[PDB]
Design a binder for this molecule. Structure first.
Ligand code: 402
Ligand code: SF4
Ligand code: SF4
Ligand code: SF4
Ligand code: SF4
Ligand code: FES
Length: 570
């Protein structure tokens, strides 16, 4: 094909004008196009271009054709785009100062680019009609919503629940949950993939910043611990680029924020493995029940509760790393510090919105003490650091407090799809064989395929394992009958494609950057690199963890560990 774009000739592909332009350093804007789909109904038309002889077309869904002459920047094109943006301003409370997307908003960028102006500024006097903060995990601010459909499409594609809907409310279109219910009261997973898809501040996480501020100000001993994924991602929000390991800077920043103890959820990950690998070995000895499923992803737990309740008894009884850590923080940690358990306030930093729901489940407490008092997302921590004027990108490295802060390489990889599986197999196989095996890499469970399997030899018998990478793939695995091609023994499920590194609490990424950078792979690489360089690569070799079990919990899977570190869903 010979195509002319802005008077420059190209000889080439069967692709859209937008993709060809993005591949050839030609500027075309876009808004509603994401995840390979636009808002098929009510298209934004921000990607308008002129095709000579045809007229104005949407570049995001128009294929190039031999002989095409395209102009991306004529007066007629720019006036059309400007008009569409102006119409969006008419429904948009354009008040960026206090907005939680001020630094990385796709809409502000477009307003500036086209010098767009509302025909009538939208100045709602009462936000309460527009705001839904009922959920434990998600919030909606419809004063910001462009009705671009990105969230609806992302929910459908990533989860297949269609829990995010277009709704007709009083003759007007909104997005929201089924019947405009609180999300939590629907089949929604609370995974936040809708948030990640949103170009503006319309969808957000339910804030826990109040909880944290108040605890830090209460003369309370405030512990903080971050998830695996945070250290592979938060630097994105400090202009550091992608794939940067910022672990040591985070520890320094958390001390500067005034936390009293700097621990790490990866220590909790090693605890989960102690319990869960022990359980797997028991199920092997007992001839089942099989399969055992992981229980550490709250989004998956809700998927099982909402769609597959017959599987709940097959979930591992080990608490998630977050909850198992929290339980220990109110029991073990007082025993080594002298703190009154009631005065410990435990904060986690997570790449996840569904972790807020998990932490707030009524039974996730003992003796009146919550396992976890507050959960802030990666985004919330970045805001806290910025509000404190901490110069994150140039901080010196520090280390965690060791007693609940050391982690093995097995715990380090939890945030990638297949990480829990690999970590668990490293311990299970030693436990079942009563041996110290040098070969610990399970590359067959790694990477971005939607469903992954492997056959593993454990103590001279073959077992089948599966890794389900994303909620939509759980539905595929079940509905297709794949779960029945063989007897599966152990199955990891993550709700977010890529695992937690791509969770709903993570930094937003510009659609153009997503096309240039494989965010799932690049964030995960930080974690696998840590494992490669850690002196301990098995959870049961974490020295601080060994001390905690030796001194306090006893043997995994029994005694005090069974009594308090487990949770079953009825
Ligand atoms: N709890 C817990 Fe997990 C651990 O460790 C996180 O913190 Fe995850 C991450 N990153 C999240 O959110 S949850 C699911 N399993 C994989 S990783
Ligand atoms: S969503 Fe974007 S354009 Fe709207 S107020 Fe927030 S930062 Fe400004
Ligand atoms: S939290 Fe997840 S399941 Fe719920 S609407 Fe958003 S994308 Fe869909
Ligand atoms: S909530 Fe966000 S992604 Fe969903 S339609 Fe509104 S602006 Fe678009
Ligand atoms: S995969 Fe990770 S970030 Fe996503 S819902 Fe599950 S625990 Fe949360
Ligand atoms: S980006 Fe093409 S119609 Fe919205």
């Amino acid at each position: 094909k010979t195509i002319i774009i802005n008077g420059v000739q190209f000889n080439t592909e069967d692709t859209t004008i937008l993709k060809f332009a993005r591949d050839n350093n030609i500027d075309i804007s876009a808004l509603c196009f994401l995840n390979n789909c636009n808002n098929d109904i009510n298209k934004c038309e921000i990607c308008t271009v002129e095709v000579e002889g045809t007229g104005l077309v949407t570049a995001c869904d128009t294929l190039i054709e031999d002989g095409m002459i395209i102009n991306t920047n004529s007066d007629a094109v720019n006036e059309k785009i400007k008009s569409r943006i102006s119409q969006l301003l008419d429904i948009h409370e354009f008040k960026c100062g206090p907005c939680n997307r001020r630094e990385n908003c796709e809409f502000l960028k477009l307003v500036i680019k086209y010098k767009a102006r509302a025909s009538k500024p939208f100045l709602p006097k009462d936000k309460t009609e527009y705001v839904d903060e009922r959920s434990k995990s998600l919030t909606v601010d419809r004063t910001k919503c462009l009705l671009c459909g990105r969230c609806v499409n992302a929910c459908g594609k990533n989860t297949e629940t269609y829990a995010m809907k277009f709704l007709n409310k009083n003759g007007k279109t909104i997005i929201g949950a089924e019947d405009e219910k609180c999300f939590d009261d629907t089949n929604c997973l609370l995974c936040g993939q809708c948030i990640i898809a949103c170009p503006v501040a319309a969808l957000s996480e339910k804030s826990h910043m109040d909880r944290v501020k108040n605890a830090l100000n209460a003369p309370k001993h405030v512990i903080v611990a971050m998830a695996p994924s945070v250290r592979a991602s938060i630097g994105e929000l400090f202009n550091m680029g992608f794939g940067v390991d910022v672990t040591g800077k985070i520890y320094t920043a958390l001390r500067q924020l005034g936390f009293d103890k700097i621990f790490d959820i990866n220590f909790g990950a090693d605890m989960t493995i102690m319990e869960e690998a022990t359980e797997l070995v028991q199920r092997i000895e007992n001839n089942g029940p099989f399969p055992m499923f992981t229980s550490c992803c709250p989004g998956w737990v809700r998927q099982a509760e909402n769609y597959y309740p017959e599987l709940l008894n097959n979930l591992s009884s080990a608490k998630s790393p977050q909850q198992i850590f929290g339980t220990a923080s109110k029991t073990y940690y007082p025993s080594i510090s002298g703190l009154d358990p009631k005065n410990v306030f435990t904060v986690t930093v997570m790449p996840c919105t569904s972790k807020k729901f998990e932490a707030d489940r009524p039974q996730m407490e003992k003796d009146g003490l919550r396992d976890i008092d507050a959960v802030i997302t990666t985004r919330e921590l970045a805001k806290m650091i910025k509000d404190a004027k901490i110069p994150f990108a140039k901080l010196e490295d520090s280390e965690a407090d060791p007693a609940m802060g050391e982690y093995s390489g097995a715990g380090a990889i939890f945030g990638a799809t297949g990480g829990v599986m690999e970590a668990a197999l490293r311990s299970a196989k030693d436990f079942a064989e009563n041996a110290e095996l040098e070969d610990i890499e399970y590359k067959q469970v790694r990477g971005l395929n939607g469903i992954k399997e492997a056959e593993v030899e454990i103590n001279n018998n073959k077992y089948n394992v599966a890794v389900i990478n994303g909620a939509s793939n759980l539905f595929k695995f079940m509905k297709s009958g794949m779960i029945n091609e063989k007897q599966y023994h152990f199955i990891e499920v993550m709700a977010c494609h890529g695992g937690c590194v791509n969770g709903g609490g993570q930094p937003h990424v510009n659609p153009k950057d997503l096309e240039k950078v494989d965010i799932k792979k690049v964030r995960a690489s930080v974690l696998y690199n840590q494992d490669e360089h850690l002196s301990k690569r098995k959870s049961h070799e974490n020295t601080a963890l060994v001390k905690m079990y030796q001194n306090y919990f006893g043997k995994p899977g029994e005694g005090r560990a069974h009594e308090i570190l487990h949770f079953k869903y009825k």
